Design a protein around this ligand. Sequence first.
Ligand code: G6G
Length: 264
Amino acid sequence: AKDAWEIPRESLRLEVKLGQGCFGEVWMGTWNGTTRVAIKTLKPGTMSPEAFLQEAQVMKKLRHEKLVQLYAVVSEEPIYIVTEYMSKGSLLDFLKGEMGKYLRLPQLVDMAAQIASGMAYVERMNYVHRDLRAANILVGENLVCKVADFGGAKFPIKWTAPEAALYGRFTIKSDVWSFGILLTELTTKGRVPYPGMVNREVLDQVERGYRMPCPPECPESLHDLMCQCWRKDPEERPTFEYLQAFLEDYFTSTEPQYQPGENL
Ligand SMILES: COc1ccc(Nc2ncnc(-c3cccnc3Nc3cc(NC(=O)c4ccc(CN5CCN(C)CC5)cc4)ccc3C)n2)cc1
């Protein structure tokens, strides 16, 4: 006796290795021979089985067309987590790669709108992401983007709100700060934010009120949105609901005069 999420081990086929960790592996493959899936492995005796199925428990109560969807679990060791497959890989890779170069503002704002949509769901459900950035966004056909999480210790300090990096105060509002940084990533073809700066200068500078400038060819109105996401006070930051609707309507309500340029 166990979950309706459980599947028989023969229904899974692991076709292509998408990468490795110290806790296991991730593969693209097939489920019931018909459906393309992403499959995550737990190397047994390298981390708690309970600690691995934590994610799966969380992903069970999560269901949105812009969050990576859990498909199934093999909940006894060797454990397996199975999700939908996103054919185009990370937004980060997609932005810097050969696709990057044809993306203009209308595709990029649309992508931001989807991510804001997935995040407004996270907001509605009172969850926190904690590592929102282009490396945790997945791209599918048709420029579908979805919010993922691939997993102190380390720090993506550059994407992380000050009250979070410094005192561990992670909220939906610290995700909003990150979303602002993700907007720069989307407008610079995936360049690392705060160019030339290192972690300590970023922390020193942002604390004194430095904010990245408007990217080249990015409308000021979009840079203003970023700046609202970067307000010193976490509660001055807007909601993802606001963000989602601002970006959906962008080319009618905010930049109706927009003309394509060289990069954006
Ligand atoms: C060329 O290169 C590639 C690479 C990838 C792909 N296509 C692909 N499509 C699908 N998934 C993967 C994928 C790749 C690598 C690792 N994981 C992947 N997906 C995946 C994702 C998850 N989990 C999540 O995304 C996730 C998302 C949100 C949450 C919410 N929490 C966040 C944490 N908070 C503190 C609480 C709330 C929790 C978990 C679990 C299991 C798997 C297998 N790749 C194609 C080509």
